[PDB]
Amino acid sequence: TPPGLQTDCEALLSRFQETDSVRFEDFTELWRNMKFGTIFCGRMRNLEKNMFTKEALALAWRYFLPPYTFQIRVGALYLLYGLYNTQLCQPKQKIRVALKDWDEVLKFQQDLVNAQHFDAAYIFRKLRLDRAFHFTAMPKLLSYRM
Amino acid sequence: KLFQASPSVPAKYVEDKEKMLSRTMQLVELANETWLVTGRHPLPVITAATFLAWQSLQPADRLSCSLARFCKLANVDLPYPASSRLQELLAVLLRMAEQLAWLRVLRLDKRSVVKHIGDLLQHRQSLVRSAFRDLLLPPCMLKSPKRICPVPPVSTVTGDENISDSEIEQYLRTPQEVRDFQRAQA
Amino acid sequence: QPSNVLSMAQLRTLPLADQIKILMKNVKVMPFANLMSLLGPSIDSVAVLRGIQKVAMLVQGNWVVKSDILYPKDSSSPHSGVPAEVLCRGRD
Amino acid sequence: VSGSGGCNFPEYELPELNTRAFHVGAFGELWRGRLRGAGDLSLREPAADSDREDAAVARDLDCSLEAAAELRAVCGLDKLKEVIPENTDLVTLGVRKRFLEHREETITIDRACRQETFVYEMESHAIGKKPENSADMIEEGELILSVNILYPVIFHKHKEHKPYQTMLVLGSQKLTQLRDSIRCVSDLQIGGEFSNTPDQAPEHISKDLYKSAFFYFEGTFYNDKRYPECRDLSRTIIEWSESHDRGYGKFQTARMEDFTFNDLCIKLGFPYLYCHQGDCEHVIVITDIRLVHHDDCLDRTLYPLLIKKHWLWTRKCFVCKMYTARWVTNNDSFAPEDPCFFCDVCFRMLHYDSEGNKLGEFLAYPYVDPGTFN
Amino acid sequence: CVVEENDPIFERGSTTTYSSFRKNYYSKPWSNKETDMFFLAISMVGTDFSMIGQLFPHRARIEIKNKFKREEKTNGWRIDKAFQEKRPFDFDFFAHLLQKVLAEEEKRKQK
Amino acid sequence: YFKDKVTGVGPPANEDTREKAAQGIKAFEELLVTKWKNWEKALLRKSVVSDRLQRLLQPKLLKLEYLHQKQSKVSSELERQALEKQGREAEKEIQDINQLPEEALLGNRLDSHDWEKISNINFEGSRSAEEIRKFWQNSEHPSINKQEWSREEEERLQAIAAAHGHLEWQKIAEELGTSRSAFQCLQKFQQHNKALKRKEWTEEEDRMLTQLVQEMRVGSHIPYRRIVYYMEGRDSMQLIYRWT
C-alpha cells in the first residue's frame, strides 16, 4: 500500500465531512477548491502511473466499508466516479469490487432512491453504463511467500 | 532403533550395528583409560560415546544435530549429566588432537573434533600417554588449589575446670522471653 | 475388497512398460509380432516398440531381454556366487 | 463421493492469509443468480440516446421524468481539463514530485521496463482477441482462475521463492488442457549419452517417454490415461499414507478426462502442488478467481495464457562468454571444474578432431537452456 | 464411565533404563534481605527451628535446618556476632516487615 | 516449504524417478555451481596438507607401535637395544617429517590424493569430490602463475595455434611456456582475438532478424540476447544497432 495515499485520503476526508448535504452540488463546489484530479496526467504515463492509479482506486473503494458513515460513503462513491471519469491514459482501470462488498451497495442505492436523491442514483446508473466494475472473489491479491 | 530404517527415522541416520558397536567400544575404552568410569555413572558415558560414534559415522549430515535431538530420535531417555560428560570426553579429544601434527595444524574445536575421532582411536595409546605425561580430576578441584587440607589450630585446651560462667547466663531464657514464647504458640 | 508369480490377468492390469518388462523377464526370447499379439491389438505399436527398446535388444531380428533386467545389482549367481556385473558382461 | 464440505461464501480461515475450501464451480451460478451480469459484449455506443436513457432510468429506479441529473454529465466530461502536477497542495502530488525527482536524478528514459513490458504484452494478448467462429464464442458467466507456479531453483538460494511465472486458465476447459499447457524445461531434456556420438539426433524427449502427471487438491489425485504408455504415480503415495497411522485420511482417486475445474473444492492462496514426470514438482498458489468480463479473451481454446512469464538468465558458455551453452560435461580432462558449460563450436573443438573421433574419456549430456520456454 | 478425560502418554517402553538414584528436593532459593531477616529472627529467638519455621510461611523446616547448618559451617563469625546481640520479641512490626518482604518479592517477580 | 506438499521428515520417491535419473536426463539439480571463498581456500589447504602428512606418518606410526609391542614382548637385552635404536631412528624420522616446511609436502597438481575423504570429512559434503579435485588441480595451486600477461605471449600463442590447427590447447600452452593452465590463457586469447566479431551487414540476415523479432519481440523492448544465441558471430554490444 502506498504510504502517501493513506494520508491523502484522510486529508480529503476532512473536506468530504465538511459537506453539509449529500447533493452532488457540494462536490462540484469542492472541485473548484480541492482539485484532486491533477496527477491524472503528470509528467509521464507508464506502468508506474498505472499501478499508482490502481492502488488509488483500490484504497479509495476500501473506504466504502459498512462501518463508515453515510456521508463518507457518498464522498467515496463520488471520488471513485470522478477518478474513473478522469482516466485519460491508455488503459481504463476499472474499480475492483468483491462479492461481499456488493452487499452493502444494494441497500445503499435503495436508501438513495427512496430518499428521492436523483443525482445519487444517476451516479450509479452512469457507473453501470460505463461498465466500470471488476467482479473478483477478493478485493486484493496476496500470496504466502512473505 | 538407529539400525533399522523404520519410517520414524530418516534413511540418513541409519547405520550398521557392528561398526557402531565397535566405535562405541573403542570410545568407552578410551574413557576408561582416561578416568571417565570411576565414580560417575556408566550409562551417561555410554550415551556420550555412542552419540560421538553416531556423529563421527556421518558428520556431513549429523554434526548439526545435538545430544537431545539424538535421544529424541532414538526414543531413549537421555541422562542429565551425559552432555557434561560428553564435554569432558570432547576435551579429552582436544588433548589428543593437539598431539597429532595434522590435527594441531588444523586447529580444531569442540565441534569439528568428532570427524577425526576414528583417527584419535587409531593411535589412542600414544595420545593418552602424551596427555598424561603433561590424570583427570573433577573440575571443582582443578581450580589450582593453593591451600590443600588446611591444618586447623591446636586448641585442645580446656582451662582448669571451667573457662567461664556467663555463657550459661547468656543461653538461658528470661521470664519475659518465656512469656513471649508461651504467647507465640499459645 | 519364481518370477511368474503374476498371472496374465494381473499382468494386463499393469502399465504397458511393466507388462513388457515382465514378459521379457519371463520368456527372454520373443518376436515383435508375438508381443503385439500377447499385449493386444488395441495398443499402438510405437508405444510397445519404445517400451521394449528400454529392456530388450535386437538379435537376428528377434528381441532378447537385457542382462541387467534378469540380474539386478543386488543379485548374484545361484551356482557360483559371482556378482551380477560379471553375469551381465558374460550375457552381453 | 460428491463435492467436499464448503460454502460458496468464502470465510477467512486465517485473517488475510487464506480461506476455507469451497466449490469454485458454484460461484459461476451464485454470482450469476445474485447479479444478472449481462453486458459482456462491449456493445457500448460510439436525441434518441437520451430518450432511451430516460425510458430506462425513469422506469427502473428514478421516478421523475426531468433530465436534471444530466448536469453531472457535463461535470464529468465537459468540466474535465497535457497538464503539470503542480500549483496544488496534495500528498499524492508530493509523492509524484518525489518520484519525478528520483527519476531526474539517475533515470534517463522510460525504456527500462522490459520486465513490465512482458506483463503488458501478455495482458494485451488477452484484449481485442476476437473468436475464430460463432460456435467458439465463450458463454457469459465463464469462470476464470489464476495460478502461480514455482518450479526452478536457479534463483536466490539464500532468500524466498519470489521470482517465477504466473498463468491463467478457464473453468469450462478440462484439466487435460491445463496439464498440457504447463511448460517445463525438464520435458525438453534428452536422455542417453552423447559423448560417443554428438551428431546423434534427438530420438525421443522426456515429454513423450514419460507422460505421467497428476494433481493434488484436498486429497483428490486426478490421474491421466489418454495414452497407454503413461503410468499411475498415485499408486505409491496412497500406500505410504495407509501403511501407518499418520493422521491423513483416505484419499479419493479419479480420472482427468472426465473432471472439470468446477468440481475442484480448493482454497484460494493455499500452497498446493502439481507433479509430473516422476518427481517434477511445481508449487501452485491459486490467488484469484472471477467471472468473465467484456475485456477478456473471447477465444476459449486459445486461453491457457501465461499472463506473466518471469525473466530468466540464460547460462552462457564458460569458454567464449559470447554464446549460450548446450552441453554439460562430466569427468572432463581439461575443464577447470566438473560442471562446466560448452557451446556447439566449443564442444566440437574440445574433444573432437576433424573427422569427429572421440578424444579422451569424458561424459557429456544435452543441456537445454531454460530460456527456450522463457 | 469417563468421557474424554485422559490423554494417551507413551512412557517406559521397557528398554534399558537410566539409573537416576537422585531425588533433588526442590528448595526455594535465599535472597539477601531474606538472609538478613533470617539472621535477625535467629538473633531474636535463638536456634529454635520450630518457632523460626512458624514465622516463615514461605520456607520449610528442613530448608531452615540446611541453611542454619551451612551458616554455622561457613560464617561462624557472623553467627556468633548475631548471637551476642539480643533484641526483644516483636510481633506487630515483625508482621509489617513480613508484608514489606512480600511486596519486595512481588516487585522482584514483576521485574 | 518449497519442494513438495509431501515434504515431511522423510520424503517419498516414485518409480518414474529411477527412469528419469538413470537415462542421464539431468535438468536443473546439477547447475547449482557457486564461487569460492577465502575460508574455503584455507580449509582446502589444511585438508590437503593434513592428508599428505597422514599418508606420510601412518607407516612410521605403525612401525613405531610395532617396535613398542616387540620390545614389550621380547626379553633379550641385545634385541632390546636394537629395537630401541630402531625406535629412536623412527622418532627422528617422525620429528623431521613434522618439522618439514609446508611447500614440499604439497606434491604436484596431479598428485595422488583421496578426494572423497577430503570432501565427506573436511568439507562435510558441501563440495563434491570432483569439484575440489579440479579446483586444486588448476584453480588453487602454488604452481599456477597468478601474474597477468604483458601483451607479449598472444602472438606466439596464435602462431602455434595456427601451426597446429587449434586441436589441443594443452600442448600449445605447454610449448608456449607460461606456467599457466590452458583455460586461463585461452580466455585472454579469445578476448584479444578478432575472429569473434563480425563484418559489414548483409541482406539475408535481415530476413532472419525480422523473423526473430516478429516472433519473440515484446513492446518497445527487443531481446537481442536471443539474436546472439541464434545468430552466430554477433555480440551484445554492437548488435543493438541492427534496430537502432
Side-chain angles (χ1 to χ4, degrees):
Chain A
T1 60
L5 279 69
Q6 302 306 99
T7 57
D8 180 70
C9 64
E10 296 180 354
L12 55 84
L13 281 180
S14 64
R15 281 185 170 270
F16 278 173
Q17 184 183 359
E18 188 67 23
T19 61
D20 58 330
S21 300
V22 299
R23 189 64 62 179
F24 59 88
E25 299 175 2
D26 57 2
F27 294 105
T28 60
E29 296 177 0
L30 290 178
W31 175 257
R32 298 180 177 89
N33 298 270
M34 67 174 282
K35 306 190 64 178
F36 59 92
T38 51
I39 202 189
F40 81 107
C41 179
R43 291 264 53 85
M44 54 169 299
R45 290 183 172 181
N46 205 75
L47 192 135
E48 299 182 1
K49 179 56 183 56
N50 183 25
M51 295 298 300
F52 196 97
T53 185
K54 180 184 302 179
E55 296 293 337
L57 300 182
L59 274 305
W61 186 262
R62 191 194 67 87
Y63 280 83
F64 207 69
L65 254 54
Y68 291 94
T69 61
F70 200 93
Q71 183 177 2
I72 299 301
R73 310 193 71 79
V74 178
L77 181 59
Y78 277 77
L79 181 60
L80 295 174
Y81 166 84
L83 288 180
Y84 183 83
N85 288 258
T86 50
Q87 293 296 335
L88 275 69
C89 196
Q90 286 75 14
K92 278 73 180 179
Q93 291 296 335
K94 301 172 293 299
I95 60 181
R96 181 175 176 179
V97 289
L99 192 271
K100 282 78 60 180
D101 206 304
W102 208 265
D103 302 336
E104 206 284 338
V105 68
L106 301 180
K107 62 185 180 184
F108 184 70
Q109 297 294 147
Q110 290 297 137
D111 204 325
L112 291 178
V113 68
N114 278 90
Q116 302 296 334
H117 291 93
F118 305 146
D119 51 327
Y122 199 81
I123 284 286
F124 197 77
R125 166 63 183 177
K126 230 288 184 175
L127 284 177
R128 289 192 57 89
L129 182 60
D130 284 272
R131 303 296 190 273
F133 306 98
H134 262 292
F135 310 97
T136 59
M138 52 182 57
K140 294 181 60 181
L141 50 92
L142 192 57
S143 56
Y144 82 110
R145 57 178 64 94
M146 71 290 293
Chain B
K1 287 82 179 181
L2 274 302
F3 315 119
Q4 184 64 25
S6 62
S8 299
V9 63
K12 59 181 62 179
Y13 298 155
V14 188
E15 285 288 342
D16 182 68
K17 183 173 60 179
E18 304 294 335
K19 300 178 59 180
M20 180 179 299
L21 209 162
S22 181
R23 196 71 63 90
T24 310
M25 188 273 300
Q26 295 292 151
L27 285 177
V28 301
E29 179 68 23
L30 172 63
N32 171 270
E33 57 189 291
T34 52
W35 302 77
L36 283 173
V37 298
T38 298
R40 294 88 178 270
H41 293 178
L43 299 180
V45 184
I46 312 306
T47 56
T50 186
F51 174 74
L52 277 189
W54 177 76
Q55 274 194 329
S56 60
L57 284 179
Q58 192 177 358
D61 301 69
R62 295 165 186 167
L63 185 51
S64 60
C65 301
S66 60
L67 183 55
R69 190 64 173 270
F70 172 78
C71 85
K72 178 180 178 59
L73 191 273
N75 194 20
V76 175
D77 50 330
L78 81 172
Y80 172 81
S83 301
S84 63
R85 298 290 88 92
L86 170 61
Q87 294 297 330
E88 302 187 25
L89 187 52
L90 294 180
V92 178
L93 304 178
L94 300 181
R95 298 189 178 273
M96 304 165 68
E98 299 290 71
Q99 205 283 334
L100 296 177
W102 62 94
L103 289 189
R104 76 191 301 179
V105 171
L106 275 66
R107 196 188 68 258
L108 300 181
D109 51 75
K110 59 178 299 180
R111 300 172 60 93
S112 59
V113 78
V114 55
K115 58 183 64 177
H116 300 95
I117 277 183
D119 298 0
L120 297 178
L121 297 179
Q122 187 176 359
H123 313 273
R124 74 178 193 276
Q125 299 181 0
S126 60
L127 297 181
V128 302
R129 286 181 179 181
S130 58
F132 289 161
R133 282 187 291 262
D134 179 68
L135 80 166
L136 183 55
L137 297 176
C140 60
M141 67 180 304
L142 290 182
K143 299 178 179 179
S144 183
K146 53 181 63 62
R147 66 184 182 277
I148 299 181
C149 302
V151 181
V154 181
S155 60
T156 59
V157 299
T158 177
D160 41 75
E161 294 292 337
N162 287 307
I163 46 178
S164 178
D165 297 330
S166 60
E167 307 175 13
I168 283 82
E169 303 291 340
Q170 184 71 15
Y171 278 101
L172 49 80
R173 276 201 173 98
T174 60
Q176 293 287 154
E177 186 176 3
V178 173
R179 286 179 288 269
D180 295 330
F181 175 81
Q182 293 180 359
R183 187 262 307 270
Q185 42 83 42
Chain C
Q1 178 66 23
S3 61
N4 299 272
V5 49
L6 302 180
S7 62
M8 183 62 60
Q10 301 178 355
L11 182 63
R12 294 181 179 181
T13 60
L14 299 180
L16 181 64
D18 297 331
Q19 297 177 8
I20 298 180
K21 179 181 179 181
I22 294 178
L23 286 178
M24 295 305 299
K25 184 180 181 181
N26 294 338
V27 194
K28 305 172 185 179
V29 166
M30 57 186 307
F32 188 79
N34 298 20
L35 180 60
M36 293 297 300
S37 62
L38 291 180
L39 293 177
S42 61
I43 309 180
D44 189 66
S45 60
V46 182
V48 178
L49 182 59
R50 293 181 299 181
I52 194 182
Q53 285 183 15
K54 299 178 180 179
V55 298
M57 304 290 294
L58 185 67
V59 177
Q60 300 181 3
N62 304 275
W63 288 98
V64 181
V65 64
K66 293 183 179 179
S67 305
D68 63 330
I69 301 299
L70 303 181
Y71 307 95
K73 58 180 60 60
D74 62 329
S75 64
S76 60
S77 180
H79 303 268
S80 60
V82 300
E85 183 178 2
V86 180
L87 303 177
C88 292
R89 294 176 181 179
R91 194 176 187 273
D92 293 1
Chain D
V1 182
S2 61
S4 60
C7 180
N8 200 84
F9 300 93
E11 307 91 358
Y12 301 93
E13 182 178 3
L14 208 162
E16 296 182 2
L17 269 69
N18 50 26
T19 180
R20 300 180 180 180
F22 62 95
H23 189 256
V24 302
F27 249 96
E29 285 82 334
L30 183 137
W31 212 340
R32 213 65 183 182
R34 199 170 190 175
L35 298 179
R36 64 174 190 268
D40 302 359
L41 295 178
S42 301
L43 62 80
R44 50 183 175 270
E45 292 77 12
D49 301 70
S50 60
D51 297 330
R52 302 303 93 177
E53 289 180 1
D54 279 68
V57 179
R59 274 73 182 270
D60 289 345
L61 287 80
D62 203 77
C63 302
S64 65
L65 79 166
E66 181 182 359
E70 273 63 22
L71 178 66
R72 167 224 54 87
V74 296
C75 55
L77 288 78
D78 300 2
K79 294 301 176 59
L80 177 63
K81 62 179 181 300
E82 61 280 353
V83 301
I84 308 182
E86 61 181 359
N87 301 331
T88 43
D89 196 333
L90 284 80
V91 187
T92 170
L93 179 138
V95 69
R96 190 63 172 183
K97 184 207 64 177
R98 295 164 189 173
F99 272 95
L100 291 179
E101 199 279 339
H102 285 293
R103 169 170 293 268
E104 293 177 346
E105 280 185 354
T106 60
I107 314 302
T108 301
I109 49 181
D110 218 336
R111 219 284 198 180
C113 55
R114 55 185 187 90
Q115 65 283 352
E116 304 172 359
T117 313
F118 300 151
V119 186
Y120 188 86
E121 185 73 21
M122 295 164 194
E123 290 291 339
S124 67
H125 273 59
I127 62 179
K129 199 66 176 182
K130 56 102 179 181
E132 307 293 334
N133 56 90
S134 59
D136 201 70
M137 173 56 182
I138 307 178
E139 59 100 29
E140 298 178 9
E142 173 66 34
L143 180 63
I144 307 179
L145 307 86
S146 53
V147 55
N148 180 269
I149 66 173
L150 302 167
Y151 160 69
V153 297
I154 197 179
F155 58 82
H156 292 131
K157 279 77 62 178
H158 190 250
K159 201 180 175 179
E160 48 274 358
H161 42 61
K162 303 175 61 180
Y164 202 39
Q165 68 182 36
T166 301
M167 304 179 61
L168 189 72
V169 81
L170 253 54
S172 60
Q173 294 279 6
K174 296 180 176 300
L175 189 59
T176 61
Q177 278 67 19
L178 182 64
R179 173 194 176 276
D180 60 59
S181 65
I182 295 179
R183 290 180 172 90
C184 171
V185 65
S186 305
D187 61 356
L188 300 180
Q189 279 286 160
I190 313 174
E193 218 287 333
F194 279 66
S195 296
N196 55 330
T197 189
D199 302 329
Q200 190 268 354
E203 65 281 50
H204 286 284
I205 59 181
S206 56
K207 178 181 179 181
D208 299 331
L209 291 177
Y210 315 106
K211 301 174 179 298
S212 61
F214 66 98
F215 288 83
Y216 174 79
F217 294 114
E218 301 293 337
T220 59
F221 296 90
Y222 304 95
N223 190 25
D224 48 349
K225 293 182 179 180
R226 307 194 311 269
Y227 299 90
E229 200 275 339
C230 65
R231 308 174 186 176
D232 195 334
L233 297 182
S234 301
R235 60 188 175 183
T236 61
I237 305 181
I238 182 73
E239 296 290 340
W240 198 82
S241 299
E242 295 302 320
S243 58
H244 300 70
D245 299 0
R246 306 179 183 272
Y248 298 153
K250 300 300 180 61
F251 297 149
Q252 184 270 349
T253 60
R255 302 286 81 89
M256 190 178 299
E257 302 83 5
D258 52 353
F259 276 76
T260 299
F261 296 96
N262 298 331
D263 53 68
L264 297 183
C265 302
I266 58 104
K267 307 179 181 180
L268 262 53
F270 187 88
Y272 300 95
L273 182 123
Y274 160 71
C275 183
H276 72 124
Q277 300 184 353
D279 59 331
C280 190
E281 50 214 2
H282 303 258
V283 171
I284 277 185
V285 176
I286 302 297
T287 189
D288 296 323
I289 55 105
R290 61 180 182 89
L291 274 66
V292 69
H293 213 260
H294 61 73
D295 297 328
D296 299 330
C297 177
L298 289 76
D299 196 346
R300 179 182 177 271
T301 62
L302 203 61
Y303 209 157
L305 296 180
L306 296 83
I307 59 182
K308 177 182 179 181
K309 298 181 180 181
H310 200 277
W311 177 264
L312 190 145
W313 302 91
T314 64
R315 304 293 288 269
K316 313 301 181 301
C317 180
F318 211 85
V319 183
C320 57
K321 301 295 181 180
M322 299 180 181
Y323 302 93
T324 304
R326 293 181 56 182
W327 309 92
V328 49
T329 184
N330 293 119
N331 300 120
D332 199 323
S333 301
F334 309 97
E337 57 274 353
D338 184 71
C340 275
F341 297 90
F342 299 89
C343 60
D344 300 72
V345 63
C346 290
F347 181 73
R348 285 299 183 269
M349 62 90 180
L350 178 62
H351 291 153
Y352 299 92
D353 48 7
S354 299
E355 55 272 21
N357 184 23
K358 180 180 180 180
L359 301 179
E361 192 276 340
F362 69 101
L363 301 179
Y365 299 93
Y367 158 66
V368 284
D369 184 74
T372 304
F373 284 156
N374 179 270
Chain E
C1 180
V2 298
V3 63
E4 183 65 13
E5 199 186 48
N6 205 95
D7 52 86
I9 287 297
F10 174 81
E11 183 280 335
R12 210 61 269 162
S14 71
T15 181
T16 307
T17 304
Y18 170 76
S19 59
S20 62
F21 184 46
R22 287 296 180 271
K23 180 176 296 298
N24 185 22
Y25 182 83
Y26 176 79
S27 180
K28 205 269 182 180
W30 292 85
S31 180
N32 183 24
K33 294 182 177 59
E34 190 174 17
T35 304
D36 281 66
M37 69 179 300
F38 181 63
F39 265 81
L40 73 84
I42 289 185
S43 65
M44 182 181 300
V45 189
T47 68
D48 197 333
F49 302 94
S50 57
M51 297 299 102
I52 297 179
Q54 289 292 148
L55 53 86
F56 269 110
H58 300 291
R59 303 300 309 190
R61 181 184 58 89
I62 181 61
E63 303 174 349
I64 294 169
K65 281 184 168 59
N66 290 277
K67 174 57 64 180
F68 185 84
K69 291 181 298 181
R70 183 152 191 167
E71 288 296 337
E72 289 280 359
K73 286 181 175 178
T74 57
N75 303 329
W77 59 277
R78 182 180 290 103
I79 290 295
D80 302 6
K81 175 182 177 60
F83 181 79
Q84 289 179 359
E85 184 180 1
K86 292 301 178 181
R87 193 172 186 177
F89 183 82
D90 202 323
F91 201 89
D92 180 70
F93 190 83
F94 189 81
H96 193 12
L97 190 145
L98 289 176
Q99 298 296 334
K100 291 181 179 180
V101 172
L102 286 171
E104 288 177 354
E105 71 177 11
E106 182 69 21
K107 291 177 58 181
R108 288 155 53 184
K109 293 181 300 180
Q110 289 179 359
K111 297 178 182 179
Chain F
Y1 182 76
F2 172 65
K3 283 180 54 61
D4 213 90
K5 79 282 177 181
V6 80
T7 313
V9 48
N14 300 19
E15 201 276 286
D16 192 74
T17 66
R18 267 64 66 92
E19 289 288 342
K20 267 296 191 302
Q23 207 178 184
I25 327 183
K26 302 171 179 179
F28 211 80
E29 63 185 342
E30 77 292 337
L31 308 180
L32 282 313
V33 55
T34 59
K35 297 182 179 180
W36 219 258
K37 293 88 178 180
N38 300 90
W39 71 272
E40 293 184 357
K41 300 174 184 179
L43 179 60
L44 180 60
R45 273 291 190 91
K46 292 180 180 300
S47 62
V48 63
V49 302
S50 62
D51 200 332
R52 195 58 204 178
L53 188 54
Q54 176 74 295
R55 183 179 297 181
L56 293 179
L57 284 181
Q58 278 183 349
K60 265 61 182 179
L61 295 178
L62 182 60
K63 187 60 179 300
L64 187 63
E65 294 181 1
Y66 178 81
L67 291 177
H68 278 74
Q69 295 179 0
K70 193 178 182 61
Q71 69 91 9
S72 300
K73 293 178 182 180
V74 79
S75 303
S76 180
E77 294 292 338
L78 287 314
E79 301 286 63
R80 271 200 176 98
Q81 294 293 150
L83 294 177
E84 183 280 335
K85 181 174 59 180
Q86 190 176 178
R88 179 259 178 181
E89 294 180 0
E91 178 69 21
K92 295 299 298 179
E93 290 289 338
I94 296 177
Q95 287 292 144
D96 61 60
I97 290 299
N98 183 28
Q99 301 295 337
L100 209 155
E102 290 77 11
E103 53 255 21
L105 48 87
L106 273 68
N108 297 271
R109 297 173 289 100
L110 299 180
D111 192 7
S112 179
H113 295 273
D114 197 333
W115 306 105
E116 294 78 9
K117 187 262 180 180
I118 299 179
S119 64
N120 79 93
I121 296 181
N122 301 90
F123 284 90
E124 293 173 281
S126 301
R127 302 299 185 176
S128 180
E130 299 83 5
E131 207 180 277
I132 55 178
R133 173 182 179 181
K134 304 301 296 180
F135 214 85
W136 178 259
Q137 285 181 357
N138 53 265
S139 299
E140 290 293 333
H141 202 272
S143 64
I144 300 300
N145 182 23
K146 301 180 181 60
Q147 189 65 215
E148 296 291 340
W149 289 3
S150 60
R151 202 152 55 183
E152 296 180 358
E153 298 81 6
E154 190 273 344
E155 290 80 302
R156 290 87 59 89
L157 204 161
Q158 62 88 12
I160 299 179
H164 186 268
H166 310 263
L167 302 180
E168 299 180 357
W169 304 101
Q170 178 66 23
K171 294 183 178 179
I172 300 176
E174 292 284 58
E175 294 292 338
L176 185 55
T178 55
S179 181
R180 300 154 61 94
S181 59
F183 201 92
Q184 188 182 3
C185 64
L186 255 294
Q187 181 174 11
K188 302 191 65 175
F189 166 76
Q190 297 184 357
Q191 186 269 317
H192 295 78
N193 187 21
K194 306 300 180 179
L196 282 311
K197 300 180 299 178
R198 275 299 182 179
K199 290 301 296 181
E200 183 65 13
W201 304 344
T202 62
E203 180 71 293
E204 55 275 5
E205 62 182 14
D206 298 329
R207 307 292 183 85
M208 179 182 180
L209 261 67
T210 50
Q211 290 179 1
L212 266 58
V213 166
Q214 297 295 335
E215 183 280 335
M216 61 193 314
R217 189 258 297 270
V218 63
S220 183
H221 171 59
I222 297 90
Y224 299 92
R225 289 308 301 181
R226 308 303 183 270
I227 317 296
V228 175
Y229 161 73
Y230 284 103
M231 180 60 180
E232 188 271 346
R234 300 292 176 179
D235 55 327
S236 181
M237 186 269 299
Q238 49 82 21
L239 181 64
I240 316 177
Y241 271 157
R242 294 299 295 267
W243 281 87
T244 302

